[PDB]
Amino acid sequence: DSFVAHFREAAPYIRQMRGTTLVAGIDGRLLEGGTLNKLAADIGLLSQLGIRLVLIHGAYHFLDRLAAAQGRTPHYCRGLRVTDETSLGQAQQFAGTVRSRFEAALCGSVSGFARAPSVPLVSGNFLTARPIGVIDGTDMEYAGVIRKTDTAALRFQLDAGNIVWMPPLGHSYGGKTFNLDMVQAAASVAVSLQAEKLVYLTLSDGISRPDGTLAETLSAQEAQSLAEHAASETRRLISSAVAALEGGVHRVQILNGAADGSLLQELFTRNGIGTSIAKE
C-alpha cells in the first residue's frame, strides 16, 4: 500500500508503545549470525521510539551442544535442566560472550541514513536466585529459580531510557550462582514489573496448530488446550505465557526472531506476524 496508509496504521501504536514496558526473552541461537546484527538494529529503533526494554537471552541449546561435544549427555528432569558446576561455569562464560557480541552489534548498527545518538545499555545484580533442590530423587544441582527481583532498580534504569540486559543467571543469599530458565525468568520478570508485553523471540513463526497453521491470537484457555499434547518446548512457552497473563502482563507475543523486521511488523500493525496471547 501507500506510505500514508502504512503510517496511519503505525502511528497510533507509536503513541501507545512509548513509555510501555516490553520484556523480550531471546533465544540464545539468535545471538550470532547475520541475525544478531538485524536484532540489534531493530531493538535499537524500539529503544529510540521510547519503548522500555528488558532483554533476557537463553542458553540451553548452547549448553546442550557444548556438553554433548565433550562426552556428558545433558539430563532433564521433568522438563528442567540439571546444571552441574562445569555447566554453570560455562554458562557464566557464555553470558559474557553474548553480552559483548550484543554491545558491539548495537554499537555498529544503523537506524537509517541520518546520524542518531548511541543506544545506552545496562546490566546489574537484579535477580537473586535460589536452587530448585531435588526432584524425583534427582539433585538439580545449580539449576535455580528467581527468589527476589530488584524491581525498583529495574524501573530506575528504565525511566532513565536504558535498555536492560539480563543473562539467565542469578546470585543467591548463600553466595553462589544459579542457572535460570529464560522462558520462565522472562515471565517472572514481566509479572514483577507489570509489563504490558512479554515477547518471546524464537526460531519459529509462533505457535502452530496441530494442522500446521500459525495460530495468530489465542486466549489463555485456548493456549492451554494446544499445550496438552505438544512439544515440551512449545509447552514451556505456554505454561509461562499463561502464568504471565495470570499475573497481569497484558499480552504475550511469540515470534520468529530470525525473520527480517518481524518485531516491527508484530508491534506496529494490527495483525502482526506471529502469535499473540491474551488472558481473555
Ligand X SMILES: NC(=[NH2+])NCCC[C@H](N)C(=O)O
The residue within the footprint of a second copy, chosen from 74, 77, 101, 214 (CB under 8 A), is: 101
Instruction: State the pairing for strand pair 163-166/52-57.
Output: parallel
Interface region with a second copy, contact rule CB under 8 A, candidates 61-69, 105-113, 191-199, 201-209: 105-113
Contacts 24+ apart (CB under 8 A), 39-45: 39/105, 39/201, 39/257, 39/263, 40/102, 40/105, 40/106, 40/109, 41/105, 41/109, 41/110, 41/111, 42/261, 42/263, 42/264, 43/106, 43/163, 43/263, 44/106, 44/109, 44/111, 44/119, 45/111, 45/264
| Using rule CB under 6 A, residue 275 touches ligand X | yes
Q: Is 176 marked as binding a ligand? A: no
148 is in an annotated binding site: yes
Nearest to 36 by CA among 140, 132, 109: 109
Q: Binding string, 76-95, against a second copy, x = CB under 8 A?
A: ---------x---x--xxxx
CB of 196 to ligand X, least distance (A): 9
Q: Which of 33, 79, 124, 225 binds a second copy (CB under 8 A)?
A: 124
Cβ distance 134 to 147 under 8 Å?
no
Q: How many residues does the chain have?
A: 280
- Three-state DSSP at 173 gives coil
Is 278 a binder of ligand X (CB under 6 A)?
A: no
Using CB under 6 A as the binding rule, the residues of this chain from 106 to 145 that contact ligand X are: none
Residues of this chain, 139-158, that bind a second copy according to CB under 8 A: 141-142, 147-148, 150, 153, 157
Interaction between residue 217 and ligand X (CB under 6 A): yes
Candidate segments 33-41, 81-89, 226-234, 262-270, binder of ligand X by CB under 6 A:
262-270
Query: Which residues lie near ligand X (CB under 6 A)?
Result: 13, 216-217, 251, 266-272, 274-276
Extract the annotated binding site for acetyl-CoA: 147-148
Extract the annotated binding site: 147-148
